[PDB]
Design an enzyme around this catalytic site. Structure first.
Site, short mmCIF file in Angstrom:
data_model
loop_
_atom_site.label_atom_id
_atom_site.label_comp_id
_atom_site.label_asym_id
_atom_site.label_seq_id
_atom_site.Cartn_x
_atom_site.Cartn_y
_atom_site.Cartn_z
CG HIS F 50 -2.06 0.96 1.14
ND1 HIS F 50 -1.91 2.30 1.43
CD2 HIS F 50 -3.37 0.78 0.83
CE1 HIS F 50 -3.08 2.91 1.30
NE2 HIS F 50 -3.99 2.01 0.95
CB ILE F 56 -0.10 5.94 0.97
CG1 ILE F 56 0.60 6.79 -0.09
CG2 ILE F 56 -1.26 6.69 1.60
CD1 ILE F 56 -0.24 7.05 -1.32
N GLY F 59 -5.85 4.89 5.30
CA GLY F 59 -6.75 5.68 6.11
C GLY F 59 -7.49 4.87 7.16
CB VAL F 60 -9.24 1.57 7.10
CG1 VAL F 60 -10.20 1.90 5.95
CG2 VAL F 60 -8.08 0.69 6.61
CD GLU F 64 -8.45 -0.88 15.10
OE1 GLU F 64 -9.64 -0.63 14.76
OE2 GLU F 64 -8.17 -1.60 16.09
#
Ligand SMILES: *P(=O)(O)OCC(C)(C)[C@H](O)C(=O)NCCC(=O)NCCS
Lengths: 150, 65, 153, 151, 151, 150, 150
Positions: F50, F56, F59-60, F64
């Protein structure tokens, strides 16, 4: 003289999990380099060193100092040149005067401060400290030779 | 009973004689013994407890079973 | 009354290191307070070679040093307490200094990386060890280490 | 040649980490036999799971390493050390039979693969042999493979 | 039960990540047969190496999963659902025979293990059967395992 | 305490590698707010995927890390720093809302989690706030969790 | 096509291990809906940390697999199954809303993603739906992405 991980990737052949420099914050050709690696618990190394006591291994501090030193050696001679970088390796010959004083742990920012001690063609002697929040956590002196990727 | 002991341990039935001891002479493994016993229970239906098994040493000792 | 040979299950009971930072597989000679020789098998199936380097697997020099420190730490501990797993859990061997290290030959998958260490100075809990790493009888690296045993606290 | 190092193996076999289970070829006779090996070290991810506090190298991975050694033997028997043709071929194993495990393999062992050709005819290869540690047979196996075009 | 879930499997089998290759038990007849399965997903480390750009679940790992399913049948046939003795025991492959690989297994498959007891004798278990995806046999195998003390 | 290090974090949260996404807690006001952070470094397994050649931080995973921070706030507000009780409870997250991603996070960033209590009613906790790098908002989120027995 | 296997998915999405969380597309209707799934197995590294002795697929990763599925829908609805075009575009997710976690997902589950287009104008896409295991809704969420040049 600010280099980010996408820049570092183009110069150093190191990859996961042996690429131990996240960012270069200062670079003076033939003189010095300041760089750092962020230390997080989300690194595989902490599964082993040590269970229930995460300590960044001293030998990997030295290795990040070597990686920062190789970056300085290379860019001093060729600037930011990814294409020539592909053809070179900074081969480390000796390490000396290593002192470990403060344990490095998840949540630290591990700064590498290296200065050129001697440069004669492809032979580079660098030395300096690793630092967390202004304190010296380690010291090292390295000698390397730039050679052709083979 | 002899083409069976031969094929289980990659010999020829010639060497397999009432004399021959499975370990010292035919070179049977711990694994080899376990499998030979299980293959003699298959050939003619029978059962041989490890009580009785352990002190079977040569082919004569089982041929009377 | 220490044995001379130790296998990975013995190593696990003394050193706190675990995957992926346990870099000694077997100990072949041990003389308390004097010398140790141990080794690590180098195989392509190690995660480190994904990074070092793509298409050119080369065991990192610093990990050779680290494997020599772990061997010396094993010698330091068993010299002071024997083979004592329960006391091993209360004690950590802390790396202090490294000196005089030279890398002569690259180490690659398929090598058996031997650690040859001898005691240069023993002062209570302070251990200075020094020696070579070797492959097929050739000196592959040299290093000198100082460690100090203190509490896992 | 008769000795091949990991960088040679990488150019012939498509297997990559963590399924490349041959580190060095020490002997190879075209159409006859191969001797290869893999170092076993505690620094392998398998040992996190197999088993905790008792690392034992899985028997199915000894068999997989014997297959990779046999495949290298088959490929180089037809085309020699040719990385360019290797990109276009795969050694597809169809059957395994007669495998036996005699001695556990543990960290610190040099796991050697000893395979000979039992039968070959075109792309169909049957190989067989042993896995050894210190001159002792720790496993044995027989495998059948078809060489096919890569896709 | 009816079904057994990963939390029960973890209490019986000693295998751990990345070598625990059964996710659920759907049928269990003591001393006779077991049906179980493992989901195959791209998010498994093995697919980095087998193969880059072509994810193929290794045949030998299908066999390993058949063996673990047989081991679960064997543990529970001998000792019931005992978490405590399970921690002192170990499974050891003895023999593998009559292995056929028929269809490749890939991410998104539910790989089902169908095993029936051929013969059992104390700690020795001979099982055989098939591995299946969507009603089709993707592999066949026959094996012997020993339950052994961890010591 | 107000400052919590990784050895304290490991005694409260059940999360382990590779899902422990909080490295240090720098402020904690019971029932009010929390400031924590995670160091982002290239040496994390997530960056293999990723993305290749463009690291990067997903975002998730920011969200979390915000949730793990809020759960720490919720637990310590009711029981303080209590490892014994922590082995007895779960912070089970129910909902997530009003998530906005504004700025990518990359290796070398210190990702700070700023969470304030929006509502506490029984065992239901509602927390919201931002994730920040160098004083800029990189993401925002609201979460609703529920403390129950283990 | 209406059914895409992992080889097709790899040619559209840039995600790789360990962040590629869709294994198969079973249903796809341009500008309407997509059905896809990820198999859940214990042999995933995430279960080492979430949680020891209680493997539970993280809720935020359910959302991520919904985002990857919905991005596959958006890309496909604009350019069809075109791998060369996919190299020139990024699907950037801006917002996430109305996330509810209803049932824990565990090894042996087939985690299905059901997404429908709620609104699309140009490069802006809003998608929503559920994640399902055995006909049961285990999570819901809505997402907005913008597609731009890579
Ligand atoms: P005997 O009762 O001594 O039999 C020996 C056994 C059957 C235990 C076997 O020969 C053995 O010692 N080892 C096989 C080890 C093995 O299967 N390794 C594969 C790892 S799963």
């Amino acid at each position: 003289s600010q280099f980010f991980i996408e820049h570092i990737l183009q110069i150093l052949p190191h990859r996961y999990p042996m690429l131990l420099v996240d960012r270069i914050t200062e670079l003076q050709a033939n003189q010095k380099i300041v760089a750092y690696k962020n230390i997080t618990f989300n690194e595989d190394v902490f599964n082993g060193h040590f269970p229930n006591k995460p300590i960044f291994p001293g030998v990997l501090i030295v290795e990040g100092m070597a990686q920062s030193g190789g970056f300085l050696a290379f860019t001093s001679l060729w600037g930011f040149d990814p294409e020539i970088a592909k053809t070179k390796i900074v081969a480390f010959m000796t390490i000396d005067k290593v002192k470990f004083r403060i344990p490095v742990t998840p949540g630290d920012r591990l700064e590498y401060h290296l200065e050129v001690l001697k440069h004669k063609g492809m032979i580079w002697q660098v030395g300096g400290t690793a630092q967390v929040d202004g304190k010296v956590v380690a010291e090292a002196e390295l000698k390397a030779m730039i050679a052709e990727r083979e | 009973i002899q083409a069976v002991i031969a094929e289980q341990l990659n010999v020829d039935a010639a060497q397999v004689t009432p004399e021959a001891e499975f370990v010292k002479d035919l070179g049977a493994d711990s694994l080899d013994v376990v499998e030979l016993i299980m293959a003699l229970e298959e050939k003619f239906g029978i059962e041989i407890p490890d009580e009785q098994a352990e002190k079977i040493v040569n082919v004569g000792d089982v041929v009377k079973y």
